Design a protein around this motif. Structure first.
Motif, PDB file in Angstrom:
ATOM      1  N   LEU A   1      22.389  43.226 -13.500  1.00 14.93           N
ATOM      2  CA  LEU A   1      21.073  43.849 -13.155  1.00 14.93           C
ATOM      3  C   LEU A   1      20.205  42.829 -12.403  1.00 14.93           C
ATOM      4  CD1 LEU A   1      20.275  46.041 -16.283  1.00 14.93           C
ATOM      5  CD2 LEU A   1      20.339  46.793 -13.887  1.00 14.93           C
ATOM      6  N   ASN A   2      18.895  43.071 -12.332  1.00 11.58           N
ATOM      7  CA  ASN A   2      17.924  42.224 -11.591  1.00 11.58           C
ATOM      8  C   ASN A   2      17.456  41.067 -12.488  1.00 11.58           C
ATOM      9  OD1 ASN A   2      16.390  41.316  -9.522  1.00 11.58           O
ATOM     10  ND2 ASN A   2      15.049  43.100  -9.351  1.00 11.58           N
ATOM     11  N   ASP A   3      18.166  39.936 -12.476  1.00  7.53           N
ATOM     12  CA  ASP A   3      17.888  38.763 -13.352  1.00  7.53           C
ATOM     13  C   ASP A   3      16.656  37.993 -12.852  1.00  7.53           C
ATOM     14  OD1 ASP A   3      20.521  39.675 -13.607  1.00  7.53           O
ATOM     15  OD2 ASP A   3      21.349  37.680 -14.055  1.00  7.53           O
ATOM     16  N   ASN A   4      16.672  37.610 -11.572  1.00  8.01           N
ATOM     17  CA  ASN A   4      15.806  36.555 -10.986  1.00  8.01           C
ATOM     18  C   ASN A   4      14.684  37.190 -10.158  1.00  8.01           C
ATOM     19  OD1 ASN A   4      17.709  34.380 -11.854  1.00  8.01           O
ATOM     20  ND2 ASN A   4      19.034  35.385 -10.360  1.00  8.01           N
ATOM     21  N   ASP A   5      13.458  36.686 -10.311  1.00 10.96           N
ATOM     22  CA  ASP A   5      12.359  36.916  -9.336  1.00 10.96           C
ATOM     23  C   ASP A   5      12.661  36.053  -8.122  1.00 10.96           C
ATOM     24  OD1 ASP A   5      11.307  36.272 -12.172  1.00 10.96           O
ATOM     25  OD2 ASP A   5       9.931  37.871 -11.502  1.00 10.96           O
ATOM     26  N   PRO A   6      12.247  36.467  -6.909  1.00  8.06           N
ATOM     27  CA  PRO A   6      12.351  35.594  -5.746  1.00  8.06           C
ATOM     28  C   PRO A   6      11.587  34.306  -6.076  1.00  8.06           C
ATOM     29  CG  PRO A   6      11.779  37.835  -5.090  1.00  8.06           C
ATOM     30  CD  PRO A   6      11.636  37.763  -6.593  1.00  8.06           C
ATOM     31  N   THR A   7      12.051  33.175  -5.556  1.00  5.13           N
ATOM     32  CA  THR A   7      11.343  31.872  -5.692  1.00  5.13           C
ATOM     33  C   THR A   7      10.938  31.390  -4.291  1.00  5.13           C
ATOM     34  OG1 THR A   7      11.429  29.730  -6.712  1.00  5.13           O
ATOM     35  CG2 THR A   7      13.477  30.482  -5.720  1.00  5.13           C
ATOM     36  N   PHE A   8       9.678  30.998  -4.091  1.00  2.59           N
ATOM     37  CA  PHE A   8       9.170  30.496  -2.783  1.00  2.59           C
ATOM     38  C   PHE A   8       9.797  29.127  -2.510  1.00  2.59           C
ATOM     39  CE2 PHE A   8       5.856  33.722  -3.427  1.00  2.59           C
ATOM     40  CZ  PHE A   8       5.925  34.314  -2.190  1.00  2.59           C
ATOM     41  N   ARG A   9      10.279  28.868  -1.297  1.00  2.00           N
ATOM     42  CA  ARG A   9      10.749  27.506  -0.921  1.00  2.00           C
ATOM     43  C   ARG A   9       9.647  26.752  -0.162  1.00  2.00           C
ATOM     44  NH1 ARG A   9      15.919  26.159  -2.586  1.00  2.00           N
ATOM     45  NH2 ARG A   9      14.809  24.281  -1.883  1.00  2.00           N
ATOM     46  N   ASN A  10       8.638  27.419   0.376  1.00  2.00           N
ATOM     47  CA  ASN A  10       7.643  26.710   1.213  1.00  2.00           C
ATOM     48  C   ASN A  10       6.258  27.349   1.053  1.00  2.00           C
ATOM     49  OD1 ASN A  10       8.135  28.977   2.797  1.00  2.00           O
ATOM     50  ND2 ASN A  10       8.178  27.792   4.728  1.00  2.00           N
ATOM     51  N   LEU A  35      18.360  34.661  -6.237  1.00  2.00           N
ATOM     52  CA  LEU A  35      19.754  34.328  -6.653  1.00  2.00           C
ATOM     53  C   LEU A  35      20.592  35.604  -6.844  1.00  2.00           C
ATOM     54  CD1 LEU A  35      18.947  31.334  -8.953  1.00  2.00           C
ATOM     55  CD2 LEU A  35      20.990  31.398  -7.499  1.00  2.00           C
ATOM     56  N   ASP A  36      19.970  36.726  -7.216  1.00  2.00           N
ATOM     57  CA  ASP A  36      20.670  37.995  -7.565  1.00  2.00           C
ATOM     58  C   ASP A  36      21.464  38.522  -6.364  1.00  2.00           C
ATOM     59  OD1 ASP A  36      19.531  37.842 -10.110  1.00  2.00           O
ATOM     60  OD2 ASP A  36      17.902  39.228  -9.614  1.00  2.00           O
ATOM     61  N   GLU A  37      22.344  39.496  -6.626  1.00  2.00           N
ATOM     62  CA  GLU A  37      23.363  40.017  -5.676  1.00  2.00           C
ATOM     63  C   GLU A  37      22.796  41.235  -4.939  1.00  2.00           C
ATOM     64  OE1 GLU A  37      26.161  38.017  -6.974  1.00  2.00           O
ATOM     65  OE2 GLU A  37      26.681  37.932  -4.841  1.00  2.00           O
ATOM     66  N   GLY A  38      23.166  41.393  -3.663  1.00  2.00           N
ATOM     67  CA  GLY A  38      22.903  42.589  -2.837  1.00  2.00           C
ATOM     68  C   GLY A  38      21.441  43.011  -2.846  1.00  2.00           C
ATOM     69  N   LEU A  39      21.178  44.251  -3.267  1.00  2.00           N
ATOM     70  CA  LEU A  39      19.836  44.893  -3.224  1.00  2.00           C
ATOM     71  C   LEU A  39      18.882  44.109  -4.137  1.00  2.00           C
ATOM     72  CD1 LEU A  39      19.371  47.436  -1.435  1.00  2.00           C
ATOM     73  CD2 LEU A  39      19.123  48.736  -3.553  1.00  2.00           C
ATOM     74  N   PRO A  91      14.346  48.044 -10.802  1.00  2.00           N
ATOM     75  CA  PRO A  91      13.032  47.510 -11.155  1.00  2.00           C
ATOM     76  C   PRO A  91      12.746  46.372 -10.157  1.00  2.00           C
ATOM     77  CG  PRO A  91      14.692  46.605 -12.646  1.00  2.00           C
ATOM     78  CD  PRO A  91      15.421  47.433 -11.601  1.00  2.00           C
ATOM     79  N   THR A  92      11.655  46.483  -9.403  1.00  2.00           N
ATOM     80  CA  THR A  92      11.254  45.511  -8.349  1.00  2.00           C
ATOM     81  C   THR A  92      10.712  44.227  -9.007  1.00  2.00           C
ATOM     82  OG1 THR A  92      10.070  45.240  -6.309  1.00  2.00           O
ATOM     83  CG2 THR A  92       8.904  46.456  -8.007  1.00  2.00           C
ATOM     84  N   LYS A  93      11.299  43.060  -8.698  1.00  2.00           N
ATOM     85  CA  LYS A  93      10.793  41.718  -9.114  1.00  2.00           C
ATOM     86  C   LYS A  93      10.111  41.022  -7.925  1.00  2.00           C
ATOM     87  CE  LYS A  93      13.419  40.338 -13.153  1.00  2.00           C
ATOM     88  NZ  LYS A  93      12.342  39.391 -13.539  1.00  2.00           N
ATOM     89  N   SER A  94       9.003  40.336  -8.184  1.00  2.00           N
ATOM     90  CA  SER A  94       8.155  39.756  -7.118  1.00  2.00           C
ATOM     91  C   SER A  94       7.469  38.482  -7.618  1.00  2.00           C
ATOM     92  CB  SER A  94       7.190  40.787  -6.613  1.00  2.00           C
ATOM     93  OG  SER A  94       6.146  41.011  -7.544  1.00  2.00           O
ATOM     94  N   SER A  95       7.105  37.606  -6.677  1.00  2.00           N
ATOM     95  CA  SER A  95       6.325  36.371  -6.908  1.00  2.00           C
ATOM     96  C   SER A  95       5.244  36.361  -5.841  1.00  2.00           C
ATOM     97  CB  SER A  95       7.153  35.120  -6.816  1.00  2.00           C
ATOM     98  OG  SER A  95       8.309  35.229  -7.621  1.00  2.00           O
ATOM     99  N   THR A  96       4.108  35.768  -6.172  1.00  2.00           N
ATOM    100  CA  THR A  96       2.949  35.596  -5.270  1.00  2.00           C
ATOM    101  C   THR A  96       2.619  34.106  -5.216  1.00  2.00           C
ATOM    102  OG1 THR A  96       2.310  37.777  -5.990  1.00  2.00           O
ATOM    103  CG2 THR A  96       0.629  36.538  -4.831  1.00  2.00           C
ATOM    104  N   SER A  97       2.428  33.542  -4.021  1.00  2.00           N
ATOM    105  CA  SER A  97       1.915  32.169  -3.805  1.00  2.00           C
ATOM    106  C   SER A  97       1.038  32.204  -2.568  1.00  2.00           C
ATOM    107  CB  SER A  97       3.008  31.135  -3.677  1.00  2.00           C
ATOM    108  OG  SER A  97       3.800  31.116  -4.864  1.00  2.00           O
TER     109      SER A  97
END
Ligand SMILES: [Ca+2]
Length: 105
Positions: A1-10, A35-39, A91-97
């Motif tokens: 399933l959807n394990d990881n939130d996106p992580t900002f690199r910059n 890190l998660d697969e495909g969609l 389920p949509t995962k997101s990060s804000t910076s």
């Protein structure tokens, strides 16, 4: 399933940009990775505030940030641009910076 939130690199990043910089200038390219697969790990980008009159836009695919008006310190001296990086997970995962822009005199 959807394990990881996106992580900002910059982000976060504080950019200083000279006043008089015209509209249509690409000032930055945001990179978030998932890190998660495909969609579950396809990243898209938007501004946190949906406000349609902002002096900057971010492209949802490329993460390229572009001016939409001439920068003028006397009009706005500082922008705190909250960037949301979202995956396409069921389920949509997101990060804000923040991309902070300071307009130099
Ligand atoms: Ca994910």
């Amino acid at each position: 399933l959807n394990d990881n939130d996106p992580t900002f690199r910059n982000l976060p990043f504080v950019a200083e940009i000279l006043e008089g910089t015209p509209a249509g200038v690409s000032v930055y390219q945001v990179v978030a990775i998932d890190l998660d697969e495909g969609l579950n790990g396809l990243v898209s980008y938007r501004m946190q505030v949906g406000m349609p009159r902002m002096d900057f836009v971010i492209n949802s695919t490329s993460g390229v940030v572009t001016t939409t008006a001439e920068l003028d310190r006397e009009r706005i001296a500082e922008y705190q641009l909250r960037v949301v990086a979202s995956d396409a997970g069921t389920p949509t995962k997101s990060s804000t910076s923040t991309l902070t822009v300071r307009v130099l005199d």
